[PDB]
Amino acid sequence: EVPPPGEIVRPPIQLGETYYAVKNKAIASWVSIKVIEFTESTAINGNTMKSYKIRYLNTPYQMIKTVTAKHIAYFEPPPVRLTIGTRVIAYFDQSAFYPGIIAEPLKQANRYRYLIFYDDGYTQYVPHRDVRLVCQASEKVWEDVRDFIQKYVEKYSVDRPMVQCTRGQSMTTESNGTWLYARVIDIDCSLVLMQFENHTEWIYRGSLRLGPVFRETQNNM
């Protein structure tokens, strides 16, 4: 099921309704909540500010918190397909909803799956049924994630350096700030499965974490 294009609607948050919100750390998993209160503040200059008292669902004791609509996401998937730069939560396969940004829309070229650049740095092709929209849009969506996601979206180009690879080639690859020897063991459209030196990772073929991309990006700049 491929949704049609159209306007992305962000309906207001309704009291007593179920949503997803940050559990602990913002970059980490988002879980089921019920909005139990709506708070609003207005200053002399006229700038309003909205906050939400949320209650976590399925807990051992009552857990309540006050968050912003930027830390809440809808419970059901959008009725229309999403585009590059849209801030979402996507079901990552621990298996959970993690915050991210749409890096590729539904295309024939990617078998109609969104490429997700997760906040935590993980990347995955997720179907439309596994994404949820964050309740509040960000003008400069990088201000919400990290410095790569700024250059990717603000200085976006279809002509960005991407590695072209084949199962069995090797290249220097960055893992937790360390450049290591890694081997191409699988490829899935814009993603490449790199096996370090047991230790495997799906990395974006246009990532600076791959030695040849880094050089190519320095050579052009």
From Swiss-Prot:
Disruption phenotype: Oogenesis arrests at early stages. This arrest is accompanied by reduced proliferation of somatic cells required for egg chamber formation, and by apoptosis in both germ and somatic cell populations. RNAi-mediated knockdown in germ cells of adult females severely impairs the hatching rate of offspring; this phenotype is partially reversed in the presence of RNAi-mediated knockdown of Kdm3.
Protein name: Histone-lysine N-methyltransferase eggless
Source superkingdom: Eukaryota
Biological source species: Drosophila melanogaster
Tissue specificity as recorded in UniProt: Expressed in ovary (at protein level).
Annotated Tudor domain residues: 81-141, 164-218
Function noted in UniProt: Histone methyltransferase that specifically trimethylates 'Lys-10' of histone H3 (H3K9me3) in ovary. H3K9me3 represents a specific tag for epigenetic transcriptional repression by recruiting Su(var)205/HP1 to methylated histones. Plays a central role during oogenesis.
Family note: Belongs to the class V-like SAM-binding methyltransferase superfamily. Histone-lysine methyltransferase family. Suvar3-9 subfamily.
Compartment(s) of residence: Nucleus; Chromosome
Transmembrane spans: none
Free-text comment on this protein's domains from its UniProt entry: In the pre-SET domain, Cys residues bind 3 zinc ions that are arranged in a triangular cluster; some of these Cys residues contribute to the binding of two zinc ions within the cluster.
